């Protein structure tokens, strides 16, 4: 037959790939960076505390001005905050209370959100009659929407539990591009700083780099033992970090096409929920299930500081674009700003 | 520029007072998640609740018993994996687990799903209301005597109907032993884990039953009572 011969040639390719991967592993990142000086103890403190949410927070995203931010709670709300003064700028009620993600358009004109309704809803904050209302609403997914991020005010990429990601044209409401190939539920995506590529971490313990304009998967990275829960890009664009349920963070490089470094401790046995780099990429912040956030030195794999301020699982995080502060959302219905 | 500070302050005030009314409404709605295998009846119970009492097959139903509001939701439009969207329901008041008690071979699937829900790290405190549905079909199969329980659960051969059993008037002891055996297989799991943070309340429903509401009301009340007890260590 032919299915078993394609399965065999598949395994042959997988071993040629493993050999081509061990071929470029001439050194390790730790040996190269062993002579650098450590970042030192990093003790950030809560500068603001943002209250108001009636349920567990699931997503947050700073704006480009690094001042406003949106947070999504399971009371059916999406609150926009002026993080400097802790005032609430908007409180958007949702037709479905099971929201799971939220993004902030780089123009500050739109917020997005979606969840178990399998629908991505875009809301125009700069409406002309007075009050924020629904502007677009994207249907087509057969699974729950786990993450979404704007490219511009008219293009938006979504990740869903039907094991697919999709690039949408908000006006026509059509999926202008579909990304398939993941086996498990896609949990997180992160767009490259130039909108040109984006990576995705799925529940099949794999991350995939996708070409936005062509709809093809360029590179697939593995190494995690369990579900990948969070992902982000290195500020340079040629590296990215992943966090998974096996209580480990891993730094992969795009051009070398294999894992570079692993961040773990034998006293942390909980599933990583969120990851994000600092402005310079020297610090990697990760949110754990044990209610804490660990700040790792992205070059030496040593753990440097902790942000112990939540009383329940930290569900999300994000660093400002100016690097001035990091926010952490948890299932206690509170957001906390750190710097 | 102080004017913009006052405009932000009064936008925050209108927001906070809308959020206060929303807090009272959300605080007074009792969310109930309906879970269970298919061919069991989740949708039929939501529909029959929407027929008699009222509400908004659709994921949700909203009904009131004695001035107490409930919102019951069954998720229909997902895949078959549930290890990640299940955590969207860690704060529900109770999970209504529906099990086709008359389907002798998909019963192991229901037991395994109940075990995975009961020992979930994020659902450790969510109590489950067990609906052993389709009792009329179970009586049909037991009286027919064509498919016997011993072929799927050999323990059933040595099982004795409990001395605390309350059969309805006119029930064959074989039917009592079959439905109380399914009852005890799920109670053996719920008490095998325990820890007193949550409990399982079995109820032998048929979906078209009029009282399903009352049973949920009575049990949500018991769950809150026991939560308040275990809070003051009185339990």
């Amino acid at each position, epitope marked *: 037959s032919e299915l078993d011969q394609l399965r065999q040639e598949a395994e042959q390719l997988k071993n040629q790939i493993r050999d081509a991967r061990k071929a470029c592993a001439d050194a390790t990142l730790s040996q190269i960076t062993n002579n650098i000086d450590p970042v030192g103890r990093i003790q950030m403190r809560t500068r603001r505390t943002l209250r108001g949410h009636l349920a567990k927070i699931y997503a947050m995203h700073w704006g480009t001005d690094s001042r406003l931010l949106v947070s999504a709670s399971q009371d059916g709300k999406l609150i926009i905050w002026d993080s400097y003064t802790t005032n609430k700028v908007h409180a958007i009620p949702l037709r479905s209370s099971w929201v799971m993600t939220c993004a902030y358009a780089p123009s500050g004109n739109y917020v997005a959100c979606g969840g178990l309704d399998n629908i991505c809803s875009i809301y125009n904050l700069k409406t002309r009659e007075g009050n924020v209302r629904v502007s677009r609403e994207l249907a087509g997914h057969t699974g729950y929407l786990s993450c979404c991020r704007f490219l511009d005010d008219n293009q938006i990429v979504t990740s869903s539990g039907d*094991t697919t990601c999709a690039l949408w044209d908000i006006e026509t409401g059509q999926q202008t591009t579909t990304f398939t190939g993941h*086996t*498990g539920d896609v949990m997180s995506l992160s767009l490259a700083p130039d909108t040109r590529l984006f990576v995705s971490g799925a*529940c*099949d*313990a794999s991350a995939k780099l996708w070409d936005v304009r062509e709809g093809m998967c360029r590179q697939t990275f*593995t*190494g995690h*033992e*369990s*579900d990948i829960n969070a992902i982000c890009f290195f500020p340079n664009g040629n590296a990215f970090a992943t966090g998974s*349920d*096996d*209580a480990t963070c891993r730094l992969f490089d795009l051009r070398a096409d294999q894992e570079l470094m692993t961040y773990s401790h034998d006293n942390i*046995i909980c*599933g990583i929920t969120s990851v994000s780099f600092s402005k310079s990429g020297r610090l990697l912040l990760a949110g754990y299930d044990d209610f804490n956030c660990n700040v790792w030195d992205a070059l030496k794999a040593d753990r440097a500081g902790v942000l112990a301020g939540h009383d329940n699982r930290v569900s999300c995080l994000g660093v400002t674009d100016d690097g001035m502060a990091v926010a952490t959302g948890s299932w206690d219905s509170f957001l906390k700003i750190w710097n | 520029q102080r004017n913009e500070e006052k405009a932000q302050r009064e936008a925050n005030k209108k927001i906070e007072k809308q959020l206060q009314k929303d807090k009272q409404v959300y605080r007074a709605t009792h969310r109930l998640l309906l879970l269970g295998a298919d061919n069991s009846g989740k949708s039929t119970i939501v529909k029959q609740m929407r027929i008699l009492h009222g509400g908004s097959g659709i994921f949700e139903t909203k009904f009131q018993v004695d001035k107490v509001n409930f919102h019951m939701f069954d998720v229909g439009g997902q895949r*078959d*994996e*549930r*290890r990640k969207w299940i955590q969207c329901f860690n704060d529900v008041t109770a999970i209504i687990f529906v099990v086709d008690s008359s389907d002798y071979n998909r019963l*192991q*699937e229901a037991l*395994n*799903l109940f*075990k*995975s*829900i009961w*020992n*979930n*790290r994020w659902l450790r405190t969510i109590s489950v209301i067990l609906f052993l549905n389709k009792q009329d079909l179970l009586a049909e199969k037991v009286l027919a005597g064509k498919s016997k329980i011993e*072929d*799927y*659960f*050999p*323990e059933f051969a040595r099982y004795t109907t409990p001395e605390d059993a309350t059969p309805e008037p006119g029930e064959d002891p074989r039917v009592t032993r079959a439905k109380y055996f399914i009852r005890d297989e799920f109670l053996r799991i719920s008490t095998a884990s325990g820890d007193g943070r949550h409990y399982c309340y079995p109820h032998f429903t048929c979906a078209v039953d009029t009282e399903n509401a009352r049973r949920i009301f009575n049990d949500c009340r018991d769950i809150i009572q026991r939560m308040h007890l275990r809070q003051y260590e009185l339990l």
Partner: nanobody
Amino acid sequence: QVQLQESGGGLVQPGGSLRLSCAASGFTFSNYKMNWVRQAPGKGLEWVSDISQSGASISYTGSVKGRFTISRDNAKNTLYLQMNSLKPEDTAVYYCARCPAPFTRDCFDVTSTTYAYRGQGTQVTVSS
């Protein structure tokens, strides 16, 4: 990359015997609860037996209770389902599934079509 390879299992007359060896590569074997999920021809996935993180607590589906055993060896990084007294209905593919999270007791791995942490299967056939 997590990958699970099962082996053993062929045409065996009723009342015979077999031993299915599932070798795991790509993770830490000790942390994960392991299961044996079988699929008979023409029916959905069925769950056969599970063994805990260290062989402490074992459990079986009713139909295979008292016939099969399941042993875990973390040293050689494998687990074995020793089947004896096979019936004409034990003919099925036998995937060796791993629960998707370490250090826990729950899993959801009998999924209808696609689960990412189970092997490929060894079609065990039993007929006269």
